[PDB]
């Protein structure tokens, strides 16, 4: 096929000389086979804190500093967490609007379940923190 195609993970295609598959520099990785150059590891700095170490074979995986939660794919960015019974607004955490609720550190206030719409009485009213608990069918 190509010379450079059983090149294992942790290595790249080299020309200058007698190495086909030379290993990756430090702070670089290639999980592929035959790569042309090794990718430079992700740095987890500031808001982010390194969860997994960087390796020749696999990239470093970013965690997200306590107070924040991981967001998007691969922890692309880091969003501030509120307590339950709040959602994060433009200005910062705010209490849920009356008749909405949120039971998580992250996320948006959702509205209470309407029990009548599903044909049940209410067993327990909701709070900012907690949903409604529908009871049985009436009558």
């Amino acid at each position: 096929q190509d010379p450079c195609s059983n090149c294992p993970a942790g290595t790249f295609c080299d020309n200058n000389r007698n190495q086909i598959c030379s290993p990756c520099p430090p702070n670089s990785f290639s999980s592929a086979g035959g790569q042309r150059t090794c990718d430079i590891c992700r740095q987890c700095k500031g808001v982010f804190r390194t969860r997994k170490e960087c390796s020749s074979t696999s990239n470093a995986e970013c965690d997200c500093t306590p107070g924040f939660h991981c967001l998007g794919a691969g922890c692309s960015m880091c969003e501030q967490d509120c307590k339950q019974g709040q959602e994060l607004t433009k200005k910062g955490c705010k209490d849920c609007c009356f008749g909405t609720f949120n039971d998580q550190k992250r996320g948006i206030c959702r509205p209470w379940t309407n029990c009548s719409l599903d044909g049940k009485s209410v067993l327990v009213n909701g709070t900012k923190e907690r949903d409604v608990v529908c009871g049985p069918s009436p009558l």
Epitope: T113, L123, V124, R130, D131, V132, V133, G135
Partner: nanobody, 125 residues
Framework: QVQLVESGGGVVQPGRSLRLSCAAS????????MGWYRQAPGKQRELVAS????????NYADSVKGRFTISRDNSKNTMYLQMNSLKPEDTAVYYC??????????????????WGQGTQVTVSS
């Protein structure tokens, strides 16, 4: 999955107290919230008190605010209703009720709800 047994019914003069017990059995982790319902002959089923097993919040009916107390004990896997200052109107069949989810949701392998047999509570002098 869940069985509920009532205890502690009986007859009492007005103003005396009584304490209902509802013992849960089997898949008790399924239970989220519980309550007491009562049914008088002629009138409709009335919710008396409810409770969140987790956090322990209670809802009472106006007609018993102040007089009744609903409580829970996870160790004994039981729910209590303390009924003080009983009135003629309190006379009804008390059913114990249990739910397995929030809103109208229920836990995958279990029942949306469960009931007990009911105990009779009579107040005449």
């Amino acid at each position: 999955q869940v069985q509920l047994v009532e205890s502690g019914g009986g007859v009492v003069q007005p103003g005396r107290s009584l304490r209902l017990s509802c013992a849960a059995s089997g898949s008790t982790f399924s239970i989220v919230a519980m309550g007491w319902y009562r049914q008088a002959p002629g009138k409709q089923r009335e919710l008396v008190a409810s409770i969140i097993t987790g956090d322990g919040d209670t809802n009472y009916a106006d007609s018993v605010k102040g007089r009744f107390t609903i409580s829970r004990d996870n160790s004994k896997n039981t729910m209590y209703l303390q009924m003080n200052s009983l009135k003629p109107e309190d006379t009804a069949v008390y059913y114990c009720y249990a739910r397995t989810g929030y809103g109208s949701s229920w836990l995958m392998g279990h029942e949306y709800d469960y009931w007990g047999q009911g105990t009779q509570v009579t107040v005449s002098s």
